[PDB]
Amino acid sequence: LQLDAHASIHENVRRLLQFTTSIMEANEEGIRKDIDSEFLHDFRVAIRRSRSILRLLNGVFDPEKTAWMLAGLRELGKRTNDLRDSDVYLLRREEYTSLLPPSLRPALDPFFSDLEADKRLHHRQFCRYLTGREYSGFMTSLKEFIAEGELPDPETAPLAAEPTGDVAAKTIRKALKKVLVHGRSDAELHELRIDCKKLRYLLEFFASLFPPKATAQVLRQMKTLQDNLGTFVDLTVQMEFLQSRLETISEAAAIGGLLTTLYRKREKVREHFHEIFSGFDSNETGELFDELLTGL
């Protein structure tokens, strides 16, 4: 993504949406033809990033347009959830049967055949949504709206006319601050993980304003904090799923198996958090951001 450093933040956020919506549209065929699971993944990342930035930078667009985009994107994202789960868990097939004693492994067959049936249903549901008018009406209106370069009423869109550099340095700095304030359980790790996502999204949005070498230095600096939190949440999610699948004797032993194995690992991940954040919460970190943001 290529930003104009002296353009208003309204201009640069529009450029972001142009970019992310073009990703959504580019990935529709691969999803519909079921080429592989990466297409839906990239489609979801584009939505998540759009929603995140539009919310972090509230006041860049007219308030009615902002709520309309956010509500539309939220519902679009929601539409992708069931199909994404289906792809995701089927992809864990080799891995899941590898955690189990060879005696519990065959009891996972009905579980994966259920997943394949779910995949078929969700694929059809989502494709029917992608080829309908509600989706295409939304996307057409969205593209049309993001083509509008004219600045909105600054009374109710007070951020729109501000210079990007200013906004970039202020928002990143505040996002880093939130991470540290908050880092200094379960609920603490879930929240902190979102703090880091929000920081990462801003970095990736604003990257073309920086020298390449300091964006990477900063993202490498965050990487183990983000790996910790991301794995901890993903395992929680997996456990929540496997939990639910139980309510619906061999198969039960197998899932109790996976559940137990993932709970174990999640506690180890947990235990290693404090070390990692304490290493991130350093004077060096705060300098690396100084170097990134200097002169903005």
From TrEMBL:
In this protein, which residues make up the domain named CHAD? Answer: 6-282
The positions making up the signal sequence are none
Name listed for the protein in its UniProt record: CHAD domain-containing protein
**What is the native source organism of this protein?**
Chlorobaculum tepidum (strain ATCC 49652 / DSM 12025 / NBRC 103806 / TLS)
Biological classification of the source: Bacteria, Pseudomonadati, Chlorobiota, Chlorobiia, Chlorobiales
